[PDB]
Symmetry: C3
Subunit: 271 residues, 3 copies
């Protein structure tokens, strides 16, 4: 597959936060979505603009120790410093010993490994996390992708212990990337929608026995994803997603999946 390159910056934002961005002064929490096809190699031209050591570490993908982004493997970045990180991917295939080598495809994530502690406790806390999707040949591609990160008792490090709203139209193929970080377990729930507990979050067919769920227990550095048909069999509406741990939802760990009719309207709701 293709050899690609991107630039990534770790920036200190306002309210003491830390973000990854594709451009100087455009950092977000979560970080930009990185999307690769199995076989693709990505060279990340990383610059740490901060006054503290920072790194880039990735789950799931192939990398050498020289791209671990750890102190252990000397692959974190001094303040103002630069480093090229290399992420490789592979397709599934038959090994010489006759076994099936699992591909890179899945819902993954990248995060800092050296801000605050040697495990990135400070960096993760402040917002140095973002989503990676690795696709298999033939995977169904969505109309939109939305990333929801349960980071301690926050969603996407938003204030007032509350999460973002995502808009779609009835019938849209909407993809969710669901990442968890920090100290606590959570349960991710979405009203009016459900997905498969498997690689793609979609049943392959009637010979896929994967449990169909609307609620999933997640812990720190868990990642999964799924695609739904917005409003399928349920209609347009304000469709709550929330942590289902009762004190978490009560704290305001809640967001809206706003599913509009094709005339742009939505049944009346009271946020």
């Amino acid at each position: 597959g293709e050899v690609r390159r991107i630039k990534l910056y770790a920036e200190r934002l306002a309210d003491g936060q830390m973000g990854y961005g594709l451009e100087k002064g455009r950092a977000t929490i979560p970080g930009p979505l990185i999307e690769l096809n199995e076989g693709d190699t990505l060279h990340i031209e990383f610059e740490n603009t901060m006054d503290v050591r920072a790194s880039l570490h990735v789950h799931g993908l192939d990398y050498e120790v020289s791209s671990d982004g750890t102190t252990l493997n000397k692959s974190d970045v001094e303040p103002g410093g630069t480093r090229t990180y290399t992420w490789r991917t592979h397709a599934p295939g038959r090994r010489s010993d006759g076994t099936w080598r699992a591909g890179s495809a899945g819902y993954w994530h990248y995060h800092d490994h050296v801000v605050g502690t040697e495990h990135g406790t400070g960096g993760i806390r402040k917002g140095l996390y973002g989503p990676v999707i690795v696709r298999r040949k033939g995977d169904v591609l969505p109309d939109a992708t939305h990333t929801i990160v349960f980071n301690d008792m926050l969603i996407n490090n938003r204030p007032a212990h509350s999460g973002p709203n995502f808009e779609a139209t009835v019938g849209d193929r909407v993809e969710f990337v669901m990442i968890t970080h920090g100290e606590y377990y959570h349960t991710f729930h979405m009203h009016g929608h459900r997905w498969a507990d498997n690689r793609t979050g979609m049943l392959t067919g009637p010979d896929d026995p994967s449990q169909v769920v609307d609620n999933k227990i997640v812990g720190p550095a868990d990642s999964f994803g799924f695609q739904v048909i917005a409003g399928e069999g349920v209609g347009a509406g304000a469709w709550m997603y929330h942590c289902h741990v009762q004190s978490h939802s009560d704290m305001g760990i809640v967001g809206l999946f706003l599913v509009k009719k094709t005339d742009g309207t939505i049944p009346g709701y009271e946020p």
Copy 2:
């Protein structure tokens, strides 16, 4: 593909509890088991007999925002109010985008979404929860179904952290619905028995790679279920089920799968 109609009532119960029932004065915790086939529509004539707003919200099934049972969608019920909730279910099928639409089938649950907080924290704590099973055409039906709800540090809101006992005979096909609620994670474990981590809790055949487990980590609003052949390869006995979080078992979060020999006896 039948249209069904039931009545459901929310009621205050003894010892500061609340429950759902099919008739006034007959509320239980957990609530009544609702069983549907994929394609069935259920109209629930729900009456809130209580002095606080209350709702019905279901996991997994198809419903419009007018049946959300939330403050957000104004679809909860005033004190002494009545409201018809509609739950729909669908069969799986091939979409016009060539993907496979997951059917409604599975182990699900319903609970209040407005007692105490706008997430039903009070209602759930006090007993407003019950199990829902949606069956696929050709699913294997059990000899009996038993519901185990880990609600905070209780089983089915019973006193003294203790779980109920369920009786079976060796060779019985026994279904468990396992639902978790409240604040805490748990691990559900059963002695002498095991199940598949998949939709039915039963391996479909040799092509089913699902992990076979006797221990499952669960969090609030998780629901799974399974069927076992009682005593299969292990024989009659008092087969403990317990949370496997050590302080949880130690405080009494334990019950018995009492599997009788064909003559009716349990060794011990």
Copy 3:
């Protein structure tokens, strides 16, 4: 299968620990690895050398109530006593009614059920746990097996919260058995390697939709395992494994999978 017999000892160890061993004065935490093929029977002649009641209890495998290792089923062992526990396993196959019977194969574990509490809370905390592997005919066998137990905030009851290092050469087939015990949930993570969320931790082939993961939430009495090709697509190095709950990693719940080049060296 085959009928196998072993001796097992429960012994007190230095620092108030308790271990199982295959020989007196060779007890380890975790206990010895027990490996069976589906259909095998294992008779364990268990001697409790300690001054308190102790038991042997197994997850996943077939056993009668007389081998429960519980007070409930009067199958624990008096101080200094001996008891023969029997574990059976079965291959999968169709029942007479056409349903698929799952099979014993999996990553399992054995532990004490009577030290400290009637759920073995003290036995487990002190180190009375070990791994069981039940293999299916045609299962891929590894070059080595390493056991990692998250016991409360310890790995394998080691002091100062640290984990063991495990050594391999690039290309080795390395099996990990991952068991959790005690009070807390955890997330197991390995740098530079990944596995399938299914029975074997390896995809059956291109029809297996199991999620591929490098991070798994686990709770008390959870067992899973997997095999990796050491350094596959990533090369030689010090490959960290760690609990991913940030306070757990920060307090030292970390270890190294040391993958050497064929020439015996590792990158700095």
